[PDB]
Design a protein around this ligand. Structure first.
Ligand SMILES: CNCC[C@H](Oc1cccc2ccccc12)c1cccs1
Ligand code: NA
Ligand code: NA
Length: 504
């Protein structure tokens, strides 16, 4: 079985996964809408009661399973719990990241495409007024995606967008086919530094932004000034727990798979806590210093609320490109910005797609080459639903992310710590640990963490399901049809996996 070559490379791969577009876009938007600096109170709390505990647990289950040659949850859940159901529950952690890959790698391709379009200067050049500057870029993006101009829910992506998507897929395969060490780890050692450099460079450039409408200091002001009155809202405390979950990448079965390449007695306590810290630093220091400030600097603090309510997607693909077109040498900035995003995704997409590679290797005894190619084949095929069918992307995101993560995490907690036994689990976490987990975290992992995840479940159940189930167009059933079909298909492979083992 493959293994991580260097302790550093492990942390950089793990952090590479956690650091993504969410760091630079989603996190700054969530903070501004939920108390600003006051949002740090429920965010840090969720990081300590839910994020950190679950991080150690997925690392634990991973290494525990990796020692026995199994990187995926259909096998691992069957080692913690020896039930027919546990294999089935485990399919979700094989199903979830495969659904994400079905649309993320594509979104990742956009950044690459925009990065190229900006580097060669093939971008709109306005013209004055905000809607006169944004619209050429709002339309620039829509021509790439192929946003429907009619009542039809049909996307028509440009030939370029499709070709970049193919190139992007190819790039992923290139790294993935070289294995864990000479591929993922080797790239994590290049990507993360390059990522940091670009972030700092952009940060410095943004602080020097001065327009008649405001400055970057106005952006850091609006973002970090604390509105404690919003801490009364449960929704802020829900968004915080959700964000931490989302930022660390919990519930996707990616940490589990990655940590299964960690050797049996190697540290996971300190190593995980490090990678988790790298992610958070990137979010508050780098990410919160580029997007929101620059937006406020150019449009003034007057629109800072309107900008934040415009969503993370608009901020990153319409707003920020439009601002760069108005700055000295801004075409290059667009290139640095999109190339910054590109790597941030590429370091996550190679992680997300490793779970399916691992399964085919571990359970179906496929070579790494075959396991990589077939995984690429599945993702490429399924993506056409995202590329061509409007709002398919959102349906996959909704189900996979939302439910998947919350439900799976709570499943991971119960199986490992309640079913497999808390004491056996706690030892599994602290074993080989450079530092030991604080004795108080035993109670957090056993009660506080699943309580949070459960209240999150209930709130989530009440607010978002009734919405998607009735008010959405009928075409969502196509996406539902397909993502259900995937789960059935993955059930079947798991079935074939166990039938092959009884023979040998
Ligand atoms: C927070 N770090 C990774 C984010 C996570 O990343 C992934 C998580 C799981 C599988 C993935 C497969 C391909 C690409 C990214 C994947 C997601 C991003 C967007 C929706 S879910
Ligand atoms: Na993150
Ligand atoms: Na990444």
């Amino acid at each position: 079985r493959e293994h991580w070559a260097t302790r550093l490379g492990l942390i950089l791969a793990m952090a590479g996964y956690a650091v993504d577009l969410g760091n630079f876009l989603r996190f700054p938007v969530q903070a501004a809408e939920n108390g600003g600096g006051a949002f740090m109170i429920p965010y840090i709390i969720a990081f300590l009661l839910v994020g950190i505990p679950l991080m150690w647990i997925e690392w634990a289950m991973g290494r525990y399973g990796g020692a026995q040659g199994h990187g995926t949850t259909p096998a691992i859940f069957y080692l913690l719990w020896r039930n027919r159901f546990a294999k089935i529950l485990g399919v979700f952690g094989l199903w979830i990241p495969l659904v994400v890959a079905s649309y993320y790698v594509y979104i990742e391709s956009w950044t690459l495409g925009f990065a190229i379009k900006f580097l060669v200067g093939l971008v709109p050049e306005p013209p004055t007024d905000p809607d006169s500057i944004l619209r050429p870029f709002k339309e620039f993006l829509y021509s790439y995606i192929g946003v429907p101009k009619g009542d039809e829910p049909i996307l028509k992506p440009s030939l370029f967008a499709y070709i970049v998507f193919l190139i992007t897929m190819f790039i992923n395969v290139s790294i993935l086919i070289r294995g864990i060490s000479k591929g993922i780890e080797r790239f994590a050692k290049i990507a993360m530094p390059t990522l940091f450099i670009l972030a700092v460079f952009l940060v410095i450039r943004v602080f020097l932004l001065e327009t008649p409408n405001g400055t970057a200091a106005d952006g850091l002001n609006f973002l970090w000034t604390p509105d404690f009155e919003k801490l009364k809202d449960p929704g802020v405390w829900i968004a915080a727990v959700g964000q931490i979950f989302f930022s660390l990448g919990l519930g996707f079965g990616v940490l589990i798979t990655f940590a299964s390449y960690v050797r049996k007695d190697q540290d996971i306590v300190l190593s995980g806590l490090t990678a988790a810290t790298l992610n958070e630093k990137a979010s508050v220091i780098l990410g919160g210093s580029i997007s929101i400030p620059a937006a406020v600097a150019f449009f003034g603090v007057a629109n800072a609320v309107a900008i934040a309510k415009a969503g993370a997607f608009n901020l990153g693909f319409i707003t920020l490109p439009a601002i760069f077109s108005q700055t000295a040498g801004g075409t290059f900035l667009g290139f640095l910005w999109f190339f910054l995003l590109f790597f941030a995704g590429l370091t996550s997409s190679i992680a997300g797609m490793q779970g399916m590679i691992a399964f085919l290797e571990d359970e179906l005894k496929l070579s790494r080459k075959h396991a990589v190619l077939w995984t690429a084949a599945i993702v490429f095929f399924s993506a056409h639903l995202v590329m061509f069918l409007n709002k398919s992307l959102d349906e996959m995101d909704f189900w996979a992310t939302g439910i998947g993560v919350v439900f799976f995490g709570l499943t991971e907690l119960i199986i490992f710590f309640w079913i497999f036994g808390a004491d056996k689990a706690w030892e599994e976490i602290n074993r080989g640990g450079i530092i030991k987990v604080p004795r108080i975290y035993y109670y957090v992992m056993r009660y506080i963490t699943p309580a949070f995840l459960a209240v999150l479940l209930v709130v989530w159940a009440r607010e978002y399901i009734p919405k998607i189930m009735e008010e959405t167009h009928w075409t969502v059933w196509i996406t539902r049809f397909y993502i259900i079909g995937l789960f059935l298909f993955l059930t079947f492979l798991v079935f074939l996996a166990e039938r092959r083992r009884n023979h040998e």
